[PDB]
Amino acid sequence: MKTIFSGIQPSGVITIGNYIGALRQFVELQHEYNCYFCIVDQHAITVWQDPHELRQNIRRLAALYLAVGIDPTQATLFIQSEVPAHAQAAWMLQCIVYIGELERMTQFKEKSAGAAAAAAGLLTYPPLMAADILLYNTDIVPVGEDQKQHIELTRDLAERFNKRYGELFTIPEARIPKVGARIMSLVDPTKKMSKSDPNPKAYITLLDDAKTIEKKIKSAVTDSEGTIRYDKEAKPGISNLLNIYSTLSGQSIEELERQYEGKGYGVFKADLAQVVIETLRPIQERYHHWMESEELDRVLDEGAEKANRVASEMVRKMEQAMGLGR
């Protein structure tokens, strides 16, 4: 089967947009493809972090991913730093990547402009990221359009390493999510729903309680026409709301439009709020079940064990080519 690698940034806050956009699709894909879910804690260490926080988010994220439906026996869920091969492979690749390729990275030139002095990690994470992917012969890397540029570099590195030392790495491919379900901001229909929006009213968290989901959905911006009709550009807000409703309820946008014929927004919002709360309630339950169960570490252990089992052998072949050790 093909292999899919997905890095997860430890922040214990994944939006309903993430869940609708790719996360949920993964709960299904995990049976056909060979999924690798890696909680990249070494990448998260490139910016100031609170030791207690970071450590807490790693558990949350792993717990929340299991809660959403990731099967620890069907897929591999592990913490990056518990697999040393990542740091080892990261170093070797840093030796074949040119300084230019790094300083030209637009994700680099972005944060390297607004500061006096940044961690060298903000300029050297590409080689590490490339390693995360290449270490598992991954074929598909589900990424956003803002990261495509990153997959490009990791592709180049692989190919360059293959020609110089012989075919070993699998040139990965960046596959984008099923198109349409791009959930927009609840306060800015044009802007996308981001976990890092300055306004918490712009997104809904898988952990948001009923009261908040109701408060946030009730504030969702709409328009002045007052009719539940889908239309990207004139009725941005309502269309976004209709999208969220449709994908979480199963009913098409046609059925929903009809179902809310003479209906106003008051009742639409009210109903949408329930379908969201009803979808997250189970997830939230399972989440706490995992958070306070020691079976969590058991899963993370066996995960790091399966990831390492592969990564190690890959790093060993790398060292072989490079000519390190014996």
Would you tell me which residues interact with a copy of itself (CB under 8 A)?
41-42, 45-46, 49-55, 58-59, 79, 81-82, 84, 87-88, 90-92, 94-102, 112, 117-124, 127-128, 165, 297, 300, 319-326
The answer to whether 144 is annotated as binding is: yes
Length of the chain: 326
Coil, strand, or helix at residue 110?
Answer: helix
Q: How far is the CB of 245 from a copy of itself (least distance, A)?
A: 39
The answer to whether 192 is annotated as binding is: yes
Report the residue number, 28 or 297, with the smaller CB distance to a copy of itself: 297
The Cα 38–Cα 19 span in angstroms is: 17
Cβ atoms within 10 Å of 85's Cβ, excluding its own? 21
Report the residue number, 60 or 216, with the smaller CB distance to a copy of itself: 60
What is the residue-wise DSSP string for 185-203? -SS-TTSB--TT-S-GGG-
Is 8:41 a contact under the CB 8 Å cutoff?
no
Which among 53, 52, 127, 117 is positioned nearest to 88, based on CA atoms?
127
The Cα 8–Cα 3 span in angstroms is: 16
The Cα 94–Cα 105 span in angstroms is: 14
**CB-based contacts of 231: which residues, under 8 Å, 6+ apart?**
238, 239
Q: How far is the CB of 293 from a copy of itself (least distance, A)?
A: 14
Q: How many angstroms separate the Cα of 255 from the Cα of each of 90, 170, 264, 265?
A: 51, 44, 16, 16
The answer to whether 9 is annotated as binding is: yes
The answer to whether 317 is annotated as binding is: no
Which candidate in 2, 109, 178, 195 is catalytic? 195
Roughly what angle, to the nearest 10 degrees, separates helices 148-165 and 121-134?
70
Q: How far is the CB of 282 from a copy of itself (least distance, A)?
A: 26
Report the residue number, 67 or 157, with the smaller CB distance to a copy of itself: 157
Q: How far is the CB of 209 from a copy of itself (least distance, A)?
A: 27
Q: How many CA atoms within 13 Å lie on the side-chain side of 273?
A: 18
The answer to whether 145 is annotated as binding is: yes
111 is catalytic: yes
Q: How far is the CB of 96 from a copy of itself (least distance, A)?
A: 6
The answer to whether 209 is annotated as binding is: no
232 is catalytic: no
Is 6:38 a contact under the CB 8 Å cutoff?
yes
The answer to whether 196 is annotated as binding is: yes
Q: How many angstroms separate the Cα of 193 from the Cα of each of 20, 95, 190, 217, 246?
A: 11, 38, 9, 13, 17
The Cα 211–Cα 219 span in angstroms is: 13
Which candidate in 192, 218, 269, 306 is catalytic? 192
215 is catalytic: no
Report the residue number, 95 or 179, with the smaller CB distance to a copy of itself: 95
Q: How far is the CB of 13 from a copy of itself (least distance, A)?
A: 17
Show which residues are catalytic: 111, 192, 195
Binding-site residues for L-tryptophan sit at 132
Binding-site residues sit at 9-11, 17-18, 132, 144-146, 183, 192-196
